[PDB]
Design an enzyme around this catalytic site. Structure first.
Site, mmCIF file in Angstrom:
data_model
loop_
_atom_site.group_PDB
_atom_site.id
_atom_site.type_symbol
_atom_site.label_atom_id
_atom_site.label_comp_id
_atom_site.label_asym_id
_atom_site.label_seq_id
_atom_site.Cartn_x
_atom_site.Cartn_y
_atom_site.Cartn_z
ATOM 1 N N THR C 1 0.765 -1.233 -0.005
ATOM 2 C CA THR C 1 0.036 -0.146 -0.070
ATOM 3 C C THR C 1 0.446 1.355 -0.323
ATOM 4 O O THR C 1 1.659 1.680 -1.129
ATOM 5 C CB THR C 1 -0.500 0.186 1.173
ATOM 6 O OG1 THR C 1 -1.496 -1.408 1.460
ATOM 7 C CG2 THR C 1 -1.669 1.535 0.826
ATOM 8 N N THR C 2 1.539 1.534 1.065
ATOM 9 C CA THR C 2 2.346 2.556 1.595
ATOM 10 C C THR C 2 3.984 2.729 0.656
ATOM 11 O O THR C 2 4.234 1.745 0.906
ATOM 12 C CB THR C 2 2.211 3.343 2.639
ATOM 13 O OG1 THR C 2 1.045 3.440 3.198
ATOM 14 C CG2 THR C 2 3.454 4.127 2.982
ATOM 15 N N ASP C 17 5.658 -0.820 1.459
ATOM 16 C CA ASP C 17 4.881 -1.916 3.013
ATOM 17 C C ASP C 17 4.761 -3.449 2.301
ATOM 18 O O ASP C 17 5.086 -3.613 1.207
ATOM 19 C CB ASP C 17 4.169 -1.207 4.076
ATOM 20 C CG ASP C 17 2.586 -0.792 2.918
ATOM 21 O OD1 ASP C 17 3.220 -1.163 1.695
ATOM 22 O OD2 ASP C 17 1.554 -0.385 3.588
#
Lengths: 213, 201, 191, 240, 238, 215, 228
Positions: C1-2, C17
């Site tokens: 995601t990040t 991540d």
């Protein structure tokens, strides 16, 4: 969502005379609750004997104006002669039906002289029907103007008032008074007036201002 | 808006109003609804203007091409048939058109009824529009086959007067056409207020 | 995601991540979020997965073909242009969080960002993903112009640490990527 | 020979006469040369007025395809105009799809494939053109290319296309090309064009000089030849 | 001679004889002369007829408000390129809302005519255009060819026996540049009267003159504003 | 584009004597997050005209690309002819109309300012194809906020100087910083003349907050 | 050699168009004369059999209510061209509420009188005479297979057109009258025909501005014949 339409407004007037065609319109272009400009004449000079005005959705007005000019040049450059008024009327009617299933949201008035040298006003609708009438009021100020022209031009609902034919200068004073009276009450109207007059000798123009609010 | 048409011994009577509004706002009072197709064909304007005008003009085109290819005047059922086959190609796409087709035939008089729903039928009496049921009532009161000419004229004039009297969507000048064996002829164009003064007492 | 991409003077430093989730369920606990295209150029993706994988495959195809026809190392801006064209061409269907970075011989390390819209911009640092707003909150606090490599590693380490700690969709393990003139250094950390 | 009709057939010795006839068609066309310096590329075309009916500034064979790339064509003129349009279209596509200037080798390969495809089929003829491609870049330097009617496209330092193809490169190669800036190479090209065919077979000619390199900051344009007027004050000294 | 049949086939000397045959087909048209001043461009053509009762075939035809053409050669290709010309005018008139520069228009004409000179299946166009226009830099007189090598000039003339016209242009191309419209037009017909045999005279009904100016719209004339232009002449020096 | 992801904000432009000045800020907000706080929103076209836009910035990049290709094409014609800014305005209007006619809008709101052949020009192009001329343009909320200041001063004085117009643009951008949520205290001022096209640097505003001391 | 439409001559020219002009010659003759009173026009039928019904063979057809025509050469190319004109006239009235003038009719026909092309078929084999009344009075119009259309004041076509044009220019001037031009035309017809002139051989087509309808004469043509 995306809407394809927006109401720009406008007010178009036409009068068929004995040998003249007067078309006048305000030049306010607005949208919602703001003013875009105070100078945009809805009137356009096609030939020496034909003036068109177009109100409603502004982009379709511009596009339709350009397409009409193109087909005017096509007819002349094919057939060595300019169109009449009713030929342009039939052509505009065929175009407005040619985009039937996605219409122009545009009111249209063609004024001009016939081949006899007399005034002829062809009204229109957003789908493309037409008729030869003496006077129409197009735009948001239609209802504010039609019964007064029934009073003066048609002399309707009157008793013992004979029929005098409409002169030129009386019609000019009529146009000035009807646009003042409509500009007092309409919100899509004011700041100017572009008056075009078709004679057998050419096109005259005249700009009369209004109140600035 | 109200049209009607009825045929009899001496041809066909065609009459209509001339009011065409824009919702609750009247656009005009002098809309000539009965569209002149030919020197031998007459169509009307019944619900929606652009569809009636365009498709009857295309029908007039095709009738002229038929005549110039066959050296022969077209029949009435032919015109109603071609009009229905043209209009049926846009079914469901939202065309409103309920005109009538009138003309003289080798079989004699001709009266057909063509919808945008494609309801091609013949018949003897028809009436189209919002206030058409008023006209059905007064005409089927006054209908016969053996009427005279002035009788039919006053009949249809009474009919359009009643229809424009009760309905609000109808008015203007009352047109009145008459189909003969040789060719059609405009009879009159009468205003409603003159008819109210004339017939009211 | 990040995802996170920081350049420095020698080159660029990437980071992500893993935790590919669906709904509230983690479908994949560890995921290679960053993707090689050319040997000096990576991209890290966000948004939907299959969209970004197909776009990465097509960009890999065109960029490798173009670089072999040039017989030269490609530019990072070239891959940025390819991603921009393909995202804008089908923006009605795609949700891409693409960030293109990598060292270039002509231009050093560069970082370009492509969000969901289709715009293309060169930045000195970039965030990406739904759980990126937080470290985006302090990336304008802790960043200093003119870092070294280890400072950028520590910077991205604390960034991805706080993002993986705070966001629910974020988490997993820390993947890093070091690209400069010399070579490609990847490692997987936790802490 | 005979055996020379279609462009798809071979010969009993194995070559294509349509390619050969297309090659020696450009041999009759006007002389067009080119030479680069250490920081630029210079073009120059011997161009002729017919008798008195021209305007000196019409139909210039020095085209300009890209911001930094232009042609120095010779052969059939309209075919060169069409090929110039294809070059402009290809450079536009590269600028659209990649966002920077086209490298000249890739452009030359695409144009060479276009030429080759027009040599392949039988419904079309091979082109009747032979032209130059010059460029400049701050990360690439000067590259000068050369395209035959067949499609064999590779690079030179100097070239000549026209009648005196051999007779120009006879003395182009005695130019000290590396150590000179292109402003000297201007009057060099002037003397090269001026030495060949002063008045012999025809009556009058006219000079154009295209000009790209470091001095133009990557621009490609015709010189202000009237400015500094390098030909005639050297041409009148080159007759002795 | 078996290779002199088709457009695609290169000659063993490299000269496409289809192009030169198209040139010779162009040379059998009517005489016409185009010439400009600094401010006014005038092209003058010659009419012919099938019979005495028949009308004269027009040559100068209208194109646009600042563009008009002469013609020599075929008529179907002439009206075909006329339709294409008007289309290319009104397209940019619709899109850009400007009148066209003439140069890009005639480049479009060359690119239009290139494909029927390279592929098989369509003949090259026998065409004799002389194009007068006004961009921002004044009048232009362009000429065409079936080989699509369009030429810019200051004074040209194509058709049958146009060489005497060309020599007249040689001996007055210094003089054309400064004069106003009237003697410019009578210079034009002092080329056309040498495009004829001397045992007859240029009449009214056989000529047409088209003037477009930097402030004057393109206009064709026939006998009526031409009888004013036909006066102001001397006889040929017999 | 049905849904604009990254929108700009208001763009201001006004004529003066022999030139037109246009200024807009440098903010790339996505929803409410100021995601891209250093961007350029004004394209310098060749020598005469100039483009500024609002709305979806990717569409603006697309039009930047297409217009740059067209301008470079006409410059490489080598004929000595360029585009008038009204020709650009005409082409852009036709492009937006034919775009929206296929039920796919380009989410833009564009301002064209150009000075060619002594006459200034200031053109507007809407998403819906609404296009007109005006002595003063203001897009988005600028038509709600800074438009009466323009129409105040132009009615009070029909012509201007360069300096007066520049200070007036400064005051209007200060106002738009005062009450627009999509505004940012960093903007660039662009000015065209007969001498060419100039884009100034990322200037700032000077605010007042003395009303905060009251209750 | 000359073998196809896609090859010039060393001197000109087609060399397919030339053979179409040669294929004009085989047809029967026809004569029209423009008079300011109105356009008169004539033709020969060349009836073979008594079984051959004379009113069935068409020579004068009706395109518009004021526009006639006459054909010369291959019948079916002419029928195709008449069909296209009948379509196009009606479209002009459709889109303009007016009559397409006859010169513009002929431009519309000659737009694809030469659009002959088999790839990217053959050129047509008929020459046509058009008579009509536009705003400028009556018009008489003469085209060809090659599309080179021009106005003619009194044109004769087909077989024996040479002496027809000769004796026509012998008798013609500008200020002729109607019935004089009618009898002058039928004199030339019975000079160029081989059969005895009667009610079945020829047919006339007269259009006038005040007599726009019925561009034909039926068996009063007998009375016109017996006056010579």
């Amino acid at each position: 969502r995306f809407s394809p339409y927006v109401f720009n407004g406008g007010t178009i007037l036409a009068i068929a005379g004995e040998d003249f065609a007067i078309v006048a319109s305000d030049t306010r272009l607005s949208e919602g609750f703001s003013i875009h400009t105070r100078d945009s004449p809805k009137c356009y000079k096609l030939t020496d004997k034909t003036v068109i005005g177009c109100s409603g959705f502004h982009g379709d007005c511009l596009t339709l104006t350009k397409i009409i000019e193109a087909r005017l040049k096509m007819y002349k450059h094919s057939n060595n002669k300019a169109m009449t008024t009713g030929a342009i009327a039939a052509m505009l009617s065929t175009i407005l039906y040619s985009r039937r299933f996605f219409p122009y949201y545009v009111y249209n008035i063609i004024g001009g002289l016939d081949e006899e040298g007399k005034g002829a006003v062809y009204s229109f609708d957003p789908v493309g029907s037409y008729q030869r009438d003496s006077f129409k009021a197009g735009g948001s100020a239609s209802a504010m103007l039609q019964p007064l022209l029934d009073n003066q031009v048609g002399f309707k609902n009157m008793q013992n008032v004979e029929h005098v034919p409409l002169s030129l200068d009386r019609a000019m004073r009529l146009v000035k008074d009807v646009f003042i009276s409509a500009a007092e009450r309409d919100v899509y109207t004011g700041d100017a007036l572009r008056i075009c007059i078709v004679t057998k000798e050419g096109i005259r123009e005249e700009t009369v201002s209004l109140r600035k609010d | 808006t109200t049209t009607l048409a009825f045929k009899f011994r001496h041809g066909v009577i065609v009459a209509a109003d001339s009011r065409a509004t824009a919702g609750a706002y009247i656009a005009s009072q002098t809309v000539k609804k009965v569209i002149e197709i030919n020197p031998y064909l007459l169509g009307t304007m019944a619900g929606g203007a652009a569809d009636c005008s365009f498709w009857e003009r295309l029908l007039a085109r095709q009738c002229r091409i038929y005549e110039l290819r066959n050296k022969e005047r077209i029949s009435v059922a032919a015109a109603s048939k071609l009009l229905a086959n043209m209009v049926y190609q846009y079914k469901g796409m939202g065309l409103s058109m309920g005109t009538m087709i009138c003309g003289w035939d080798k079989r004699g008089p001709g009266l057909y009824y063509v919808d945008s729903e494609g309801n091609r039928i013949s018949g003897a009496t028809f009436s189209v529009g919002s206030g058409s049921v008023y006209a059905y009532g007064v005409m089927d009161r006054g209908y016969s086959y053996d009427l005279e000419v002035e009788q039919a004229y006053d009949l249809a004039r009474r009919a359009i007067y009643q229809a424009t009297y009760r309905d609000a969507y109808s008015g203007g000048a009352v047109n009145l056409y008459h189909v003969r064996e040789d060719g059609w002829i405009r009879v009159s164009s009468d205003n409603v207020a003159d008819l109210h003064e004339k017939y009211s007492g | 995601t990040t995802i996170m991409a920081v350049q420095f003077d020698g080159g660029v430093v990437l980071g992500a991540d893993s935790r590919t989730t669906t709904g509230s369920y983690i479908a994949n606990r560890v995921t290679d979020k960053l993707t090689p295209i050319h040997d000096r150029i990576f991209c890290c993706r966000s948004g939907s997965a299959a969209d970004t994988q197909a776009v990465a495959d097509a960009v890999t195809y065109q960029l490798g073909f173009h670089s072999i026809e040039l017989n030269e190392p490609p530019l990072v801006h070239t891959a940025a242009s390819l991603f921009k064209e393909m995202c804008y061409r089908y923006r009605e269907d795609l949700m891409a969080g693409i960030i293109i970075a990598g060292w270039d011989p002509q231009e050093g390390g560069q970082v370009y960002s492509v969000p969901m819209g289709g715009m293309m911009v060169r930045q000195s640092f970039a965030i990406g993903g739904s759980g990126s707003s937080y470290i985006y909150g302090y990336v304008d606090a802790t960043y200093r112009e003119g870092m070294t490599k280890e400072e950028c590693l520590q910077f991205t380490a604390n960034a991805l640490a706080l993002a993986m700690e705070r966001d629910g969709s974020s988490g997993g393990v820390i993947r890093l990527a070091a690209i400069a003139e010399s070579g490609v250094e990847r490692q997987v950390l936790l802490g | 020979t005979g055996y020379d009709l279609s462009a798809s057939t071979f010969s009993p010795d194995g070559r294509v006469f349509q390619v050969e006839y297309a090659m020696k068609a450009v041999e009759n066309s006007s002389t067009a040369i080119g030479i680069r310096c250490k920081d630029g590329v210079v073009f120059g075309v011997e161009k002729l007025v017919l008798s008195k009916l021209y305007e000196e500034g019409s139909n210039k064979r020095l085209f300009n395809v890209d911001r930094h790339v232009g042609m120095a064509v010779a052969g059939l003129l309209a075919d060169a105009r069409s090929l110039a349009d294809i070059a402009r279209e290809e450079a536009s596509n590269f600028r659209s799809n990649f966002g920077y200037n086209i490298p000249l080798k890739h452009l030359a390969d695409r144009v060479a494939m276009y030429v080759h495809a027009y040599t392949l089929y039988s419904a079309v003829r091979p082109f009747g053109c032979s032209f130059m491609l010059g460029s400049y870049s701050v990360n690439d330097g000067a590259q000068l290319y050369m395209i035959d009617p067949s499609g064999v496209s590779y690079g030179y330092w100097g070239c000549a296309i026209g009648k005196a193809r051999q007779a120009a490169k006879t003395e182009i190669e005695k130019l000290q090309m590396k150590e000179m800036t292109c402003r000297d190479i201007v009057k060099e090209v002037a003397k090269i064009i001026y030495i060949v065919h002063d008045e012999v077979k025809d009556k009058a000619f006219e000079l154009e000089l295209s000009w790209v390199g470091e001095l133009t900051n990557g621009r490609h344009e015709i010189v202000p030849k009237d400015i500094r007027e390098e030909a005639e004050k050297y041409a009148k000294e080159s007759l002795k | 001679n078996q290779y002199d049949n088709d457009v695609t086939v290169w000659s063993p000397q490299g000269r496409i004889h289809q192009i030169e045959y198209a040139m010779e087909a162009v040379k059998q048209g009517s005489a016409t002369v185009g010439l400009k001043s600094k401010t006014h461009a005038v092209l003058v053509a010659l009419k012919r007829a099938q019979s005495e009762l028949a009308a004269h075939q027009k040559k100068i035809l209208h194109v646009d408000n600042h563009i008009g053409i002469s013609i020599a050669g075929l008529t179907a290709d002439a009206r075909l390129l006329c339709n294409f010309m008007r289309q290319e005018c009104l397209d940019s008139r619709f899109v850009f809302d400007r009148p066209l520069p003439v140069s890009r228009l005639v480049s479009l004409i060359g690119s239009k005519t290139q494909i029927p000179t390279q592929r098989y299946g369509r003949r090259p166009y026998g065409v004799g255009l002389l194009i007068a226009g006004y961009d921002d830099m004044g009048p232009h007189i362009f000429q065409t060819c079936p080989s699509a090598n369009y030429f810019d000039c200051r004074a040209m003339s194509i058709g049958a026996r146009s060489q005497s016209a060309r020599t007249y242009l040689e001996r007055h191309m210094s003089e054309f540049m400064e004069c106003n419209l009237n003697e410019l037009v009578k210079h034009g017909l002092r080329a056309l009267r040498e495009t004829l045999p001397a045992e007859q005279d240029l009449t009214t009904k056989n000529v047409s003159i088209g003037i477009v100016g930097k402030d004057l719209e393109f206009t064709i004339y026939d006998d009526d504003d031409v009888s004013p232009f036909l006066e102001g002449l001397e006889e040929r020096p017999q | 584009t049905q849904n604009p992801m990254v929108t700009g904000t208001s763009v201001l432009g006004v004529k003066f004597e022999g030139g037109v000045v246009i200024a807009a800020d440098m903010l790339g907000s996505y929803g409410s997050l100021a995601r891209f706080r250093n961007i350029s929103r004004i394209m310098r076209v060749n020598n005469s005209t100039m483009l500024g836009a609002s709305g979806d910035y990717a569409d603006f990049q697309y039009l930047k690309q297409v217009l740059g290709q067209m301008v470079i094409d006409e410059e490489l014609l080598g004929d000595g002819h360029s585009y008038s800014p009204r020709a650009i305005h005409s082409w852009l209007t036709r492009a937006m109309y034919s775009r929206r006619s296929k039920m796919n809008p380009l989410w833009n709101t564009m301002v064209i300012g150009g000075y060619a052949d002594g006459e200034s020009f200031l053109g507007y192009v809407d998403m819906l194809g609404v296009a007109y001329e005006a002595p003063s343009l203001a897009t988005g909320y600028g038509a709600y906020l800074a438009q009466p200041l323009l129409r105040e001063v132009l009615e009070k004085q029909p012509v201007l100087s360069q300096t007066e117009a520049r200070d007036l643009v400064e005051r209007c951008m200060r106002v738009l910083y005062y009450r627009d949520a999509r505004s940012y205290n960093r903007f660039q001022i662009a000015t065209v003349t007969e001498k060419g096209v100039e884009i100034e640097g990322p200037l700032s505003t000077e605010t007042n907050w003395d009303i905060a001391h009251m209750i | 050699y000359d073998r196809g439409v896609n090859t010039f001559s060393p001197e000109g020219r087609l060399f397919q168009v030339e053979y179409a002009i040669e294929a004009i010659k085989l047809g029967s003759t026809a004569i029209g004369i423009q008079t300011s009173e109105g356009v008169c026009l004539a033709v020969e039928k060349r009836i073979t059999s008594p079984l051959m019904e004379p009113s069935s063979i068409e020579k004068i057809v009706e395109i518009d209510a004021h526009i006639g025509c006459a054909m010369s050469g291959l019948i079916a190319d002419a029928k195709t061209l008449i069909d296209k004109a009948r379509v196009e006239t009606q479209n002009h009235w459709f889109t303009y509420n007016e009559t397409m003038t006859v010169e513009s009719v002929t431009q519309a026909v000659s737009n694809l009188a030469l659009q002959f092309g088999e790839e990217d078929s053959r050129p047509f084999g008929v020459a046509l005479l058009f008579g009509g009344v536009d705003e400028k009075g009556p018009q008489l119009f003469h085209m060809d297979p090659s599309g080179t259309f021009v106005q003619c004041d009194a044109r004769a076509i087909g077989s024996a057109s040479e002496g027809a044009q000769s004796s026509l220019q012998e008798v013609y001037h500008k200020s002729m009258t109607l019935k004089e031009a009618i009898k002058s035309s039928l004199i030339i017809l019975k000079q160029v025909m081989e059969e005895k002139l009667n009610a079945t051989n020829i047919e006339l087509a007269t259009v006038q501005p005040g007599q726009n309808f019925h561009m034909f004469t039926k068996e009063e043509l007998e009375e016109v014949i017996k006056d010579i």
